[PDB]
Design a protein around this ligand. Sequence first.
Ligand SMILES: [Ca+2]
Ligand SMILES: [Ca+2]
Ligand SMILES: [Ca+2]
Ligand SMILES: [Ca+2]
Length: 293
Amino acid sequence: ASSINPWILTGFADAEGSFLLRIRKNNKSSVGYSTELGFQITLHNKDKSILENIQSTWGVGVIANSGDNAVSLKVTRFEDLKVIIDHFEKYPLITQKYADYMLFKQAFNVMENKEHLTIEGIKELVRIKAKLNWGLTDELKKAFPEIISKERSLINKNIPNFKWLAGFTSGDGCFFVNLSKKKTKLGVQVKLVFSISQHIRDKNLMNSLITYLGCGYIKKKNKSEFSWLEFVVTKFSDIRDKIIPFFQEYTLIGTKLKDFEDWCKVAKLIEEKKHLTEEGLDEIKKIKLNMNK
DNA sequence: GGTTTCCACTTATTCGACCTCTCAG
DNA sequence: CTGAGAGGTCGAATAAGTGGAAACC
Ligand SMILES: [Ca+2]
Ligand SMILES: [Ca+2]
Ligand SMILES: [Ca+2]
Ligand SMILES: [Ca+2]
């Protein structure tokens, strides 16, 4: 296993990490509840190597299958959480997930004091959990109606450095070869697309990518009640002169690195105008077939 | 006996990956 | 004709989370 640059790791955690606070009804526990605090990343099987590298970097965490297609790294051994905290104190998250991290830290402090072994400490964990991720289940709310949770901190941080973006892109980004039929004797337009997807809660961060990368635009997307954003670059001069040199310098991790490598092969053919030939179109369709999914 | 840690594997829905058309220069 | 956006779809590699019991103090 290889170690991962810490800012790349934090950017990847902003895109792929989740904090965890289990408060479980437990007939064997003196206070009727047991707890489990943690941090986890779930990826496709093909990216198991990233999880082994993170495990090797931090020296913590257990890896297991997550269903038929995915694999997780989960850190819940309590002493190992100190490694997680030590990392994110030095290399802080910048999406809204930073607020979940802060709630995770509060829960750590409660459990370090063994307060979770008292009913009052369980109550304090429920207060913290109420704003963490999806919040309290209805079943738990019914158990602790008394609870009043402090409102959730809205995060508005800047991108700390390019390595963070390399990690974030390795998680939530997409390098895509768009083919769209036209009329023309050739008949197909080849267009390279770079995009990053994110929940609308981080509108500010996503909007800032345009200024930070000096190209792109934001698309708002919806699906029933859910909404998210796409930062998108389609202009070939920006792909060739901004996006490609950026990730050539700030190296992606995992399978997305291979997608980016194939994507650049297509950019080369496009720069040589080989995409407006039948022989070059063959080559590009071959590269596209071998990418992503 | 009580508590912590790990593995199996899911639900919810935020991602990624995928497609097609318009129209300015 | 070509490029750059416009305007989408869609499935789960989504983000998040639960049941059971091994493992331990
Ligand atoms: Ca993400
Ligand atoms: Ca994931
Ligand atoms: Ca991903
Ligand atoms: Ca088992």
